[PDB]
């Protein structure tokens, strides 16, 4: 297989505004097919990317900066990965649909990137909910690390896997006061799992693993999950970073299709997390190890002072449908403390005052259940409340209303669930029978309410719902009314069809 | 039309070697179609480029550094510019879109020189008759100098180059390092190109000649005798600006235009100090108030902004294109603003020692005459010795041999000539009569021999042959043998058909 820690970790370029003034900042980002070096031991890797880079241009925004972005489609008409077509109306309809969603963004539905607000090359053909070309981002939210990715109806797994993903960092006058590592020591890390062929081209399954004969199934077929052979950080496969012996701020973002990591430093140094999806934690938390699921973001600090002239590997203890291989997916990247101290370097902590969030005075309680469904061909259809995306809206919160959502997971798998617009807070988890639900259907709890860990007590937009467990989440639906979405961020699950509309007002 | 001096002059990225060691340095450069910026007030333009950049990744090489480059074709199978099929004869199923990279001014073995008929389609699916190697080797047995790599595909060169396949290749020498010249941030490549864009931000290349009466009998599309662009780009951008410190800067000026020849001069009439030509450093630096720069000529120059702090000095042109120079447009190249503050001297010494004093008396004298005739349709074919590229070889220099070539220009045009593999030296120019020649066919000289200017006394690979004039140049054909080319580097002339093979036996 490919030799590890040979390619230098690329810092994704900051996006340059086409035009900028006090009133607003305008960007023009085009989606293109390009051929990029993933590893120096393979050939060119055809990828679909934002402005010719994987990850896409990192967009730097400030609280209440009117960031306008024209997301353009300059892709081939046909797709280079397997497109099943037995997922979604056979009145085809352009094959290559694209729409950009800013994950964790406080935006109006108009510029949120609705799955059915898609567009083909130069907007030649659009989706039913298409409205405008130039998306507006007012950024009325806390300092945090947001990421933009394709959300095209039933193509999200493929378009994201193809490389359509990038960083969107929001800075805040509060943030500047925290005396953290900045500039050269403030590095975004987009972790993705992938598989490549000998010819250096991408590989994405045409059928599920078992797949008896050609009996019943379509070709190509959607897979219930996808676990990659190799691990890429930002651009490159198992890369390295030359660091100074000092404190670094890494913005860790799991952008993988299904894979969930359990990251830890090879030296068992403490990984100090200062922030989650929504922004800074109530307090920084000493991790040692920690789990990171699709679309979760961990704003972290690691101190290399005292490991001067030493090699420290970023390791994973989380398998993917199989035991973690030490030679491959047990590794993420490698820090080498070789670069010298540019200047005198000491850096050292009170944090964000954590709002009271009283759930007793809520406006409504919802009980949402995760369930699996079968199809004609006899393969899993992952569903929310046993409801297909295309069915009538059930989740209809009022503009201003505060709701408590009880996510029940009877399934054997863990599911990271994500909600557009809002940043919710986790109340608690509670384990239930997972066996009488086989006979009856009524929930009964094995144990008492377990409050979330300190890193989950902050603002989250994507949360792990564990198996045989009910997790309660409170959210204040403010602001911007209109139609949004909530879904599971496992791409394979999201498409076909663990995704439902969410109507504010 | 376009508002000038609004876009920053970009500095083309240095190429990163795939792999490198003492024995060799290996690069993988792919040609791709991408959509760039170009100018804030025009939308993204579709371009063909090397590793997604215009210009291509500037490659930094050292004297005797084994440079191995894999030039790959990842282009569409059809071309986006006109393509006149009535120029070159078409073999079996000659694919549309042929590519081959030539390192202009490179001391390369024929195999790695990029022969016009050593072309290749996408991923080498189909090759040209003289195709041999997938990887090109560059041993770099030559002086410190400003080289550039560009497409030289048989009868497509004008289009493929216009589309943007052009990049810098810098040879550095141990006796270039001792010069104490401006280095790193203050050593800037400047690729000047003329272009025309449509309102939609797409490229425009003429489909026919300027005037056509009832489409006459002429074909569509037709190749034009010359191509003059309305807008001027430096490196990436249209009429850009450069924020400079008040000190000495080293600019490597390269005219990469189709047809257009510039007469550059600083608007403040500050001295432009040229230190080097095509082949390398001059015998002495020479002071230049204004100077003429023709396609494929390189001027290694130093400009001192020290005396002009806080001012705005524009780089101007006084050279028209089949038309009076327009002050609002093609009279301008770019704009230097001396606002950046001083990080961290007054020149250094006349320069490079070179061979003694045009000794001549070589093994062979050639008399090559430039001519123009007509075709079926009644448009100009430009030819060398009234010989088409596909006729038998007349220019066959022996491997050791030193030849003197007498280029006779009876033509009304200035036709600059380029020779592959060698770096020749100019003996002299001498104007004849032309009318005597056109009427009789005998050369008779109006005036005595005029020795070249001090900047032409060095090593050149492309030289301006003026009208009604004979120019003598001497060249030592070492150190490689095989099949090479010589031609006029006005691309439109080059393609139909002012190009001939040169055998080095
Ligand atoms: Cu997301
Ligand atoms: Cu989202
Ligand atoms: Cu799921
Ligand atoms: Cu979503
Ligand atoms: Cu050339
Ligand atoms: Cu050349
Ligand atoms: Cu010519
Ligand atoms: Cu040439």
Numbering used by the authors:
A (entry chain B): 2 to 89, 91 to 350, 353 to 509
B (entry chain A): 2 to 345, 348 to 352, 354 to 509
Please share text taken word for word from the publication where this structure appeared.
Bilirubin oxidase (BOD) is another well-studied multicopper enzyme. It contains four copper ions and allows the oxidation of bilirubin as part of the heme metabolic cycle. While many redox-active enzymes are electronically isolated from their surroundings, BOD can be activated by a direct electron transfer mechanism that occurs through its T1 site. The latter acts as an internal redox mediator and by a sequential electron transfer process activates the T2/T3 site.
Here, we report the first crystal structure of the bacterial BpBOD solved at 3.5 Å resolution. The BpBOD crystal structure reveals a dimeric form. Interestingly, the BpBOD core was found to be more structured compared to the enzyme peripheral regions. As depicted, long and unstructured loops “cover” the catalytic sites, representing a large portion of the enzyme surface. Each monomer contains multi-copper T2/T3 and T1 sites having three and one copper ions, respectively. T2/T3 site residues His103, His105, His151, His153, His422, His424, His491, and His493 chelate three Cu2+ ions and exhibit high evolutionary conservation. The adjacent T1 site is comprised of residues His419, Cys492, His497, and Met502 that coordinate a single Cu2+ ion at the enzyme C’-terminal region. The revealed oxidation state of 4 Cu2+ can be correlated with the enzyme resting state. The cysteine pair Cys229 and Cys322 was found to form a disulfide bond, located 12.4 Å away from the T1 site copper ion. In total, the BpBOD sequence comprises four cysteines: one disulfide bond pair, one T1 site chelating residue (Cys492), and one oxidized Cys146 located 12 Å from the nearest T2/T3 site Cu2+ ion.
